[PDB]
Design a protein around this ligand. Structure first.
Ligand SMILES: Nc1ncnc2c1ncn2[C@@H]1O[C@H](COP(=O)(O)OP(=O)(O)OP(=O)(O)O)[C@@H](O)[C@H]1O
Ligand SMILES: Nc1ncnc2c1ncn2[C@@H]1O[C@H](COP(=O)(O)OP(=O)(O)OP(=O)(O)O)[C@@H](O)[C@H]1O
Lengths: 298, 283, 272
């Protein structure tokens, strides 16, 4: 469980970014990716308005050049999650009510990708149906050795477009030969191997057990979206769709985009221990979505 | 009972009168063709072939110990939705001994370990013995089924060896299998071998290989549409046809000398036609 | 069979007395959707449906009267909105597998409203509809109506559609009922037509259907054109039955057959 003293210690504002940075402190950078991983771990809020089932599970996919610590993040998420199973491309049922870490996601089989489509749309495996309420975290690498911004997402990483569109957030990590950044990374790695710990930072990293406790406490709350804020949702989505129809080259801001935005906002309000989704949650969800969009652009 | 007059004695007087009337009909061929398949429009040649299959031929056995075939088989190939399965459906409806399948077929030797006896459950071929075995989807059969069908057509037997129990079961029947050409479109440019996916011996054993073409005839389309609407809106009854068929099967005609010479002449003419290179034959 | 009140029966008959009742009821199903009148007419016919006839008297298999409709096109035409409106009003076709399509064909050997998407996520005018959806001839032949929904790249239209989408994500059903036709009246009309209206084929309607099938076969006899098949006649019969049920008529008229042929032509986009 938890104590009230811990509640005071973590009730300070901006604790969202604190928990984000507390995830895998060894990895240098990738702050927004860590925030997305935190949202995936906490997850959204399920709802049944008029019997309409609305799942809250969040799926995140990591893409980009090899050797940029993808497997490090995958392993850390797998270990920190209360229930998780790590597996390669070549199971899901055992991941129910947990996180399923699937590394080398591009080397799977389309026959199982049909079942993955079923799970991502229904959270069930119909053979008798078995529950598959598992949030999927996936990592992929380019099939040509490097990622080319010229080529599209499907060309660089051979995978059906729809399945790529299913994921709530898609991250593109590119390795750039910048002298200063390389020097900082080298200092970071040398410090880690020397002092057997991460370099000092502004905020003390959280412990794993306390992190699990607070994740469970946030999971307890189930906030709902008020209709007053929904008008700003109309303005935001109509502007987003106008931008999408401005240039159609990228993935359209389809209904899945809006549903993912709602889920992210509800999860953000859930972490803040609030029962009502506010303007800040929508702003943060839009910021994350636009950050992912800019990551895709090259 | 095999004597025709014996069954006539079993039959009533009115039945014998009806049989005599059917035997004396000059247009018995056309009347039987029309009554056997009333719903289907056109395709008279296939109806005639199916009727001849139903009547069958006279079996013989050589003094050398071999047995001569006395049954004929018909395979129908046509475009989709050309009512080929309707032929099988009507044949099964008319024939009480017909066994319809969709491509288990041979036998099932299930040992009753309680009594330690290998009781065999008859397959489709066994149940259709001394009759007609309608096999739709003939081109979808597995390799084992193809081998079994070829063996049945070549040796009119069914051999089974399960749990070290070798047995041979007789099976004498006619096959009315139907299948579609490869791709669903019959290419007149290609021969039957290219159009139909079937093993060579199975294709060779067949007779009266009828081929169906849609032909998109407008008058026939009007007739078909009117027939369908009327359905939404027989000279001889089936029982009479069955009685006459049994009576005819009780007969056993024999070849005559003049017919023999004419057969030899016609075979010579047919072989000369096939050897002629004016038009390549499909088989 | 609901005990339809005489006032309700009178109101339904007065609605049926209007010459625009077909178009009025087509629009009544979510008129906020930008045009798509023919698609709404098809969905209305699917809601009404044909007459259930038991043909065991003829020995032949009973003919299905339900109408199967396929909606084809790129995302962005708000198909999901109209589908949800239909589901509320009345309680992966792109990614179909070849093994699954074979299983479906075997099942069909013994009303479907499907939405289709392009494989490339964009409609190719140079490629035919069959190639764009990647579906077989056998499966496509089992859909009575196949509507081609094109997504025009117009900023005004896309703005209207996006605003309507967020309205659906924001507006409650109470405001939709207040702004548009009452859904209870439409439900009562549908129940009345499906229960009491049992149209019968007339001689003129029969001849019109037969001549329509003959004309379709003549079209199919041309080079490169799709050959007409007998299932098309049954589809036309079902569509005529549904259209007759729309007008509360107990007899199928030649107008019903002509409207069915027009709807089938507009769905297939034969003119282009
Ligand atoms: N911030 C960082 N950026 C880049 N590399 C880092 C960073 N932090 C650590 N590393 C180093 O990067 C390596 C991570 O390799 P890892 O096996 O995780 O690669 P990966 O990208 O997950 O692999 P792949 O995608 O090829 O299967 C380690 O050597 C680690 O020390
Ligand atoms: N002269 C005719 N030729 C063809 N079809 C006819 C004719 N008269 C009536 N029909 C009707 O047309 C339809 C023919 O299609 P049918 O379903 O019988 O095809 P099929 O032989 O089973 O096809 P497939 O096996 O290739 O799927 C049937 O409903 C049949 O009753």
């Amino acid at each position: 469980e938890l104590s009230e003293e811990e509640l005071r210690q973590i009730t300070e504002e901006d604790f969202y970014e604190k928990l984000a940075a507390s995830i895998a402190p060894e990895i240098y950078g990738h702050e927004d990716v860590k925030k997305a991983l935190l949202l995936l771990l906490v997850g959204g809020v399920d709802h049944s308005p008029r019997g309409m089932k609305i799942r809250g599970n969040i799926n995140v996919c990591l893409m980009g050049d090899p050797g940029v610590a993808k497997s490090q993040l995958l392993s850390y998420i797998d270990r920190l999650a209360p229930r998780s199973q790590y597996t390669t491309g070549r199971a899901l049922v055992l991941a129910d009510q947990g996180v399923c870490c699937i590394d080398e996601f591009d080397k799977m089989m389309d026959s199982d990708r049909t079942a993955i489509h079923e799970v991502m749309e229904q959270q069930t495996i119909s053979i008798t149906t078995l529950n598959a309420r598992c949030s999927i975290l996936a990592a992929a690498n380019p099939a040509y050795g490097r990622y080319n911004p010229k080529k599209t997402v499907e060309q660089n990483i051979q995978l059906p477009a729809a399945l790529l569109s299913r994921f709530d957030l898609l991250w593109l990590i590119q390795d750039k030969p910048d002298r200063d950044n390389d020097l900082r990374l080298a200092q970071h790695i040398t410090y880690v191997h020397q002092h057997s710990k991460q370099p000092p930072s502004q905020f003390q990293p959280m412990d794993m057990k306390l992190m699990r406790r607070y994740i469970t406490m946030c999971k307890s709350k189930q906030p709902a979206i008020p209709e007053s804020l929904a008008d700003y949702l109309t303005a935001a989505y109509v502007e987003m769709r106008k931008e999408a129809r401005t240039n159609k080259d990228m993935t359209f801001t389809s209904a899945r985009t809006l549903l993912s935005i709602l889920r992210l906002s509800t999860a953000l309000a859930r972490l803040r221990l609030e029962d009502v989704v506010e303007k800040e949650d929508v702003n943060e969800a839009m910021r994350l979505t636009e950050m992912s969009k800019d990551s895709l652009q090259g | 009972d095999q004597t025709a007059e014996s069954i006539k004695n079993q039959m009533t007087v009115q039945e014998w009168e009806k049989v005599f009337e059917m035997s004396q009909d000059k247009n018995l061929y056309h009347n039987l063709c029309t009554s056997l398949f009333p719903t289907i429009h056109g395709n008279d040649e296939i109806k005639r072939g199916v009727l001849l299959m139903l009547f069958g031929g006279v079996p013989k056995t050589t003094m050398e110990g071999t047995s001569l075939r006395g049954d004929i088989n018909v395979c129908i190939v046509g475009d989709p939705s050309t009512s080929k399965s309707q032929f099988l459906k009507h044949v099964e409806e008319f024939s009480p001994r017909a066994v319809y399948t969709s491509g288990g077929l041979t036998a099932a030797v299930v040992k009753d370990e309680e009594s330690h006896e290998f009781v065999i459950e008859a397959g489709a071929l066994m149940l259709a013995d001394n009759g007609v075995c309608c096999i739709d989807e003939f081109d979808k059969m597995d390799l084992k089924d193809q081998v079994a069908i070829h063996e049945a057509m070549e040796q009119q037997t069914i051999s089974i060896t399960k749990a070290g129990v070798k047995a041979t079961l007789n099976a004498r029947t006619s096959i009315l299998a139907a299948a579609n050409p490869v791709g669903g479109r019959y290419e007149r440019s290609k021969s039957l071998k290219h159009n139909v996916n079937l093993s060579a011996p199975i294709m060779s054993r067949f007779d009266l290989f009828f081929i169906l073409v849609d032909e998109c005839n407008e008058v026939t389309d009007y007739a078909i549409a009117r027939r369908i609407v009327d359905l939404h809106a027989r000279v001889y009854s089936i029982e009479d046809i069955q009685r006459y068929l049994l009576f005819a099967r009780q007969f056993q005609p024999k070849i005559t000398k003049e017919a023999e010479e004419f057969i030899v002449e016609q075979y010579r003419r047919l072989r000369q036609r096939d050897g002629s290179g004016v038009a390549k034959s499909s088989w | 069979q609901k005990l339809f009140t005489e006032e309700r029966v009178a109101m339904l008959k007065e609605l049926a007395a209007k010459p625009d009742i077909y178009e009025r009821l087509a629009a009544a199903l979510a008129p906020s959707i930008y045009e798509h009148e023919d698609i709404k007419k098809g969905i209305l016919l699917q809601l009404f449906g044909g007459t259930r006839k038991d043909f065991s008297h003829t020995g032949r298999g009973k003919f299905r009267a339900e109408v199967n409709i396929l909606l084809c096109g790129d995302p962005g035409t708000s198909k999901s909105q109209l589908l949800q409106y239909v589901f509320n009003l009345v309680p992966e076709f792109d990614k179909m597998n070849e093994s699954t399509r074979s299983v479906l064909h075997e099942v069909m050997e013994q009303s479907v409203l499907a939405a289709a998407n392009p494989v490339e996520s964009q409609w190719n005018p140079k490629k035919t509809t069959i190639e764009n959806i990647q579906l077989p001839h056998t499966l496509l032949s089992r859909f009575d109506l196949i509507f081609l929904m094109l997504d025009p790249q117009d900023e005004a239209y896309d703005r209207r559609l996006a605003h309507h989408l967020v309205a659906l994500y924001y507006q409650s059903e109470e405001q939709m009922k207040e702004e548009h036709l009452d859904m209870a009246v439409l439900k009562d009309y549908i129940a009345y037509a499906r229960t009491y209206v049992n149209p019968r084929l007339s001689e003129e309607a029969s001849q019109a259907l037969i001549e329509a099938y003959v004309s379709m076969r003549k079209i199919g006899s041309g080079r490169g054109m799709v050959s007409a098949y007998p299932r098309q006649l049954e589809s036309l019969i079902r569509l005529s039955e549904a259209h007759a049920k729309v007008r509360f008529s107990n007899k199928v008229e030649t107008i019903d057959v002509e409207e069915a042929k027009r709807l089938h032509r507009e769905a297939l986009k034969q003119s282009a």
